[PDB]
Design a protein around this ligand. Structure first.
Ligand SMILES: [Zn+2]
Lengths: 467, 83
RNA sequence: UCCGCGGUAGCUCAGGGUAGAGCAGCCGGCUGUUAACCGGUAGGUCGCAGGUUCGAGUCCUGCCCGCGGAG
């Protein structure tokens, strides 16, 4: 629907100002109940929507996750520490969309600092799943997903560290891409695990994902970890193998819910009638990756969130003593954050560094290896984004049960591989999603594959009306 | 293998002051988590391709915009409680 | 320095209500033992000094000592 809008705009049938007014209204009427947006781009939207021409993304408006810097707009990262913080600079990704006519609708709700898998850890309020108001939209990009599924926005930006983009996309029945680590800039991302974080696009169609990535991705002189690889995404004008080899991961086959297994089998039939060589492969240590993640990520998180004392920009807790002030200000963290940064401090702490961090590092290198070897025999990998559909609020009381939400999604980040999450059915009016993987840098290929699947069927629905 | 003393030590290192209620709570969580992670198997274990930035000046923030983030400022300085 | 296991007969280690067993020692038995074994018996700063308890080897505060482990 995104590319459809830009079409109507370029032909003069509609003006960008018209599109904004339309979406702004829808938000003001539906968001109250949904709770997808934290902040909204004030008068600076209507004003900015009437001072643009015929650029590629003119009529488009984007919903950005609130841990991504937007100059002049409140960027809270879903935390109390930053509930009044407004960046004097703009995230490279966002900056690029803006230069192509795009505009920010508002900022999306997330789990505090991106650490969460249900949005139930937002310092402000939970977000509701448009398909079922009694169930979570996933996390931590729960807001962005929820916004898309309710057509509160044509485009959306999210953040992925352990599936924070894929898991929500699955729960809300939309597309979520985690780009090869290095494709999109991290400058402007209030990130928590530097080695694993990546801004990811999400949309209601694969052609739309192409629009975002083509605009957002690319080398940034400010990010020393960014790759010099031209996007070239919108060349989804298919000359697609036929005949790619697809490898299904055994380890992720057992433990899935009826609707996931069902959606999985059906997808295979589809890829076969498409000309793909489907074969079962082995991801030996994949099941043990969840552990390595919850020792590598927390480690980096402790050091990344260390800067949040009340000295220069956060909230000040009021101590009057400085050490005491720092100690009191950080107490404003949520239960989940505290939990993770306490783990992170332990894993790096003296006497435990090699025993844990050093251990998880060596294991992280195994996965990359086992993956290199797998892509010597196959061209794509397939598994569920999650073993089940969105769960109802209240479950996942045990912090561990929450972590195991990212059982299948952690592999992507730990290795760095591109991973796409596409809709693949419904476990009874509940959207279930499947996860495609490709070798490093072959983002465009898995999108191309995603198109074939999408075209081979038309299976995507919107819980709320779409304008 | 996690004593209440370590928690204290950790919360010290992280400069995070939690309530005695949270301490008892997190004490149980951390235990379970550190057990889950400890299950990680040990295994045996690249080329340097990093780049450098040119020594060319880039415009700075205007003092006004910088101090606007500060909870407390005084005569062009960031103001914090005393040591 | 920190952390984790230890400190009980002589030696090597068992365990909130006389502190125990086999090795050797003592007494008694046995002509082929290889670390002989059978009975009986003697053997104590439970680490040291302070607490809870009616009662502490056992639990809890500090210290001494040994081994091991950390970038
Ligand atoms: Zn500078």
């Amino acid at each position: 629907l995104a590319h459809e809008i830009r079409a109507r705009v370029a032909r003069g049938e509609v003006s960008p100002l018209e599109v904004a007014q339309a979406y702004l209204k829808r938000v003001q009427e539906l968001d109250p109940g949904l709770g997808a947006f934290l902040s909204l781009n004030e008068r600076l939207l209507e004003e900015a929507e009437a001072v643009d021409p015929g650029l590629p993304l003119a009529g488009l408006v984007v919903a950005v996750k609130d841990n991504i810097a937007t100059r002049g707009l409140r960027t809270t990262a879903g935390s109390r520490l930053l509930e009044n913080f407004v960046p004097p600079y703009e995230a490279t990704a966002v900056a690029r969309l803006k230069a192509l006519g795009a505009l920010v609708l508002g900022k999306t709700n997330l789990d505090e600092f991106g650490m969460g898998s249900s949005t139930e850890h937002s310092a402000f309020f939970p977000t509701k799943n448009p398909f079922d108001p009694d169930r979570v939209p996933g996390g931590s990009s729960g807001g962005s997903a929820a916004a898309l599924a309710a057509d509160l926005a044509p485009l959306a930006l999210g953040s992925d560290t352990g599936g924070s983009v894929r898991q929500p996309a699955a729960f809300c029945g939309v597309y979520g891409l985690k780009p090869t680590y290095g494709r999109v800039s991290r400058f402007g991302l209030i990130a928590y695990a530097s080695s694993l974080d990546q801004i990811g696009p999400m949309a209601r169609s694969v052609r739309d994902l192409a629009l975002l990535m083509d605009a957002a991705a690319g080398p940034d002189p400010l990010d020393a970890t960014s790759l010099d690889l031209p996007p070239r995404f919108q060349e989804a004008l298919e000359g697609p193998l036929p005949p790619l080899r697809l490898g299904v991961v055994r380890e992720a086959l057992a433990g899935n819910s009826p609707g996931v297994e069902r959606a999985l089998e059906e997808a295979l039939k589809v890829f076969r009638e498409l000309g793909l060589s489907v074969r079962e492969v082995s991801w030996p240590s994949l099941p043990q990756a969840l552990a390595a993640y919850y020792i590598l990520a927390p480690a980096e998180a402790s050091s990344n969130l260390a800067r949040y004392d009340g000295t220069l920009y956060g909230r000040r807790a009021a101590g009057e003593e400085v050490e005491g002030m720092m100690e009191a200000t950080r107490a404003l963290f949520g239960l989940e954050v505290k939990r993770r940064v306490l783990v992170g401090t332990f894993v790096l702490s003296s006497g435990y560094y090699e025993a844990y961090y050093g251990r998880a590092q060596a294991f992280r290198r195994r996965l990359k290896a086992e993956a290199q070897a797998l892509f010597r025999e196959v061209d794509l990998l397939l598994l569920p984004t999650t073993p089940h559909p969105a769960f109802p609020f209240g479950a996942r009381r045990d912090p561990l049960a929450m972590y195991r939400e990212d059982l299948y999604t952690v592999g992507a980040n730990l290795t760095g591989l591109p991973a796409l999450s596409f809709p693949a059915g419904f476990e009874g009016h509940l959207p279930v999603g499947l996860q495609l993987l490709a070798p490093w840098g072959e983002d465009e290929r898995l999108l191309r594959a995603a198109l074939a699947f999408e075209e081979a069927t038309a299976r995507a629905h919107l819980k709320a009306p779409l304008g | 293998e996690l004593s209440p003393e370590l928690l204290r030590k950790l919360e010290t290192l992280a400069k995070i002051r939690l309530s005695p209620e949270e301490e008892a709570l997190l004490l149980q969580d951390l235990k379970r988590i550190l057990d889950f992670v400890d299950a990680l198997p040990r295994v045996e274990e690249e080329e340097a391709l990093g780049r450098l930035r040119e020594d060319e000046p880039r415009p700075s923030l205007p003092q006004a915009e910088a101090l606007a983030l500060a909870p407390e400022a005084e005569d062009g300085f960031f103001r914090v409680p005393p040591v």
